[PDB]
């Protein structure tokens, strides 16, 4: 029998930490695909739909995760690509087909095999158009890329050199088509809590009536982006004929000080046992006690980066340690407590 | 005998609905094109004349459909190209003359059986300039694309690589007249509206005699686009030139409230049936009472998107039902009520 939501979900949770709402769109969607692409109009209904997805949130999140641990227990074709390289039909940079035909690699140019795959674009943020730039100009990475993509979300077929061709002699394409593709974007918005603001809120208002601002920290970044609507992606330069090829949405909500405490321990691939399988080569152990785990939760979140900014506070610490560790002999195992995070005490090293 | 504008129409009906102006245009012009060829080259009026097609409407009206169902009840070859990849001079991209051989692929290489094929383009307004102004640069994919489609809407004979030879010793071409050929140009126009805006409000003053703009609604994008004309696409960007080539217009109105609700059913390619088959397979029916899909049509509007953007209602309440339903036993039948729309209440379940 095919997969279950409650096990894909069992799967990437342990991968990944903090993101109910969002694990719940890809297992719905990956567990739609098997349906939609075993019974091809072969059954009663017909005109099988289609629904891809949009990943938003906050960056260090957990975007870019999903879609490297859905290729592992994913087992059609699965590709990672960008949208920051790609230009409008013609110029030096690159050409949409290119998705295609990195798709065709690991599918081995199984035409069929290739059609029935999955597609994840990342950095879609990247090629928003400019509410106000100067008309007369043309976007090609921004405005002609989503342009590009419209006929390609809603299915087509596209000429694709099949291994680039020996030589001119050849000068045939092959057709894929693309309407039952599934398409993954995702890409961390910046500016787009302003824009929900302002029609959310609709104060601003220096007078008596008006109502001012209570404090200065307000419209919370998981609670504001939850009130996403398509409407608030057109001022921020997406246009709606793109937006509607992409009815599923989804907000991640930003860390937790719990949650990053959850990251270093719980996964398999967490830091802190990057960093113990570093020095379980080098004949030395390593510890990390909770004490420290939750004072590094207030120094990632202060710096407002993500999880991917938690390596600053680790190798940070921890410099002054690997400097001279492998001079050091005759020392088996390491303690690292509190106040090192804080940098007012050394790391007791002990001998063996 | 040939088909009939009320018998083609039918047909269109069962998988469009509230598109009765762009409806009767399509058919006349079928019609007409079979009694155009029904004649051989030769009837009383010599050199009988041609007239194609621009339909314009707003995000997700239909245009797109009605191309895929006129495929299926045309005999004719038809085509559903695109304006995205052209490129004028022979550049990388693509070139105009691959609309002509991929209508071959179609009609297997039948020269007398592909002059009388229809084309369509999808993506028009993508080609348009910014401004009034000629250019201030070579752009490639904009003008330039116009001022090469001037001549094959008009009539000429490009050279097509038939099959695209074995190798360099061939080196031919076949001619393929177009003054014959049918072409439906359209694309959803954006900005459009504000531009006859100027024309016809006549601008707005701030005194007391003026009139102002009454409320935030007003000119709805229907109602004002069926005040277009040639004129007004001249300050958008296309040259009068190509537009003389299309001297018919169809302007389709947006999805109103009553109009969503006939779509979720009578279409035999709906959602409600989508989902319906999905679950048929799966052993569990589906139920969608009138006073959910009420709610639901108000919902899409406020999206701005169109009937495209309606799947983001309806993925949104199922995804919780779809993604503990497999590991569930002993369900039979979902109703969903009104109130699980607005997600204050949650989907009905049906055990036996
Ligand atoms: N939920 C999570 N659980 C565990 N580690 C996480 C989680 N979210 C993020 N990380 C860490 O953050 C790293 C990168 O996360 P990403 O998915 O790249 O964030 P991102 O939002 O995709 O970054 P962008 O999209 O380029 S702004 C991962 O390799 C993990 O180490
Ligand atoms: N009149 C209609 N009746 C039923 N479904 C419709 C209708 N119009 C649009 N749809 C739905 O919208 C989908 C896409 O319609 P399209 O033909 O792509 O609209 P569109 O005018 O082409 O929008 P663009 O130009 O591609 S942005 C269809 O597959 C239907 O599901």
Known sequence: ALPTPHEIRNHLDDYVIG??????????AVYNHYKRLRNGDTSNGVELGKSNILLIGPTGSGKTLLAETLARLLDVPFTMADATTLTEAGYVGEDVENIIQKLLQKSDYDVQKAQRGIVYIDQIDKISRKSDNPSITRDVSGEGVQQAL???????????????????????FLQVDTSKILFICGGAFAGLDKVISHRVETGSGIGFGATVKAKSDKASEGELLAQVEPEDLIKFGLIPEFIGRLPVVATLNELSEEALIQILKEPKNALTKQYQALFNLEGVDLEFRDEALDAIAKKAMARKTGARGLRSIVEAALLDTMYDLPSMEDVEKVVIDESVIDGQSEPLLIYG
Chains 1, 2 share one sequence.
């Open 19 to 28: 993101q109910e709402q969002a694990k719940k769109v890809l297992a719905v």
């Open 150 to 172: 419209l006929k390609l979300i809603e299915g087509t077929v596209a000429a694709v050199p099949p291994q680039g061709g020996r030589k001119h002699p050849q000068q045939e």
